[PDB]
């Protein structure tokens, strides 16, 4: 692929899951966006909280992260701002087992190489099915450290 020179940086934590998908940003490209498989035998509320950092200097505008649980488009509130980052928190209520779409743009040129990953809700075990075009990884808890980023 052609390199753009945009490098944006993007962590996504499940906060009663207790787990942390880092660096889930493309590499290269302004682009942000993710595939989970939530799996869940059991009702619940499944709250995600996105740390965005848009490679400023290198863009005109930092685009918005949209949502689409099971087909559904679901809101994305930007509810925090810092000097850097971006702050979003989405809260999804799931009965049965459901694939949440995170994405910025719509070009499979884009979306393919966007990470998928499975997480089971009930286990707390997970999977990266696909890195695409990123250097992510998954850690399975959520640290203090991360957690005073948008406290």
Known sequence: ??????????????????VSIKHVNLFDGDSYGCNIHLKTATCKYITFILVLEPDWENIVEAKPIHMRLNGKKIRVPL????????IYKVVIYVEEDALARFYSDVERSYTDVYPTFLVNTDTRRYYILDSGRTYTYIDPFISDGDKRRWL
Not at 79 to 86: E, I, P, Q, R
Request: glycine share 4%; proline share 0%.
């Open 1 to 18: 692929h052609m390199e753009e020179g945009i490098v944006h940086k993007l962590d996504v934590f499940l906060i009663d899951e207790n």
């Open 79 to 86: 509810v925090a701002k810092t000097h850097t980052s971006l």
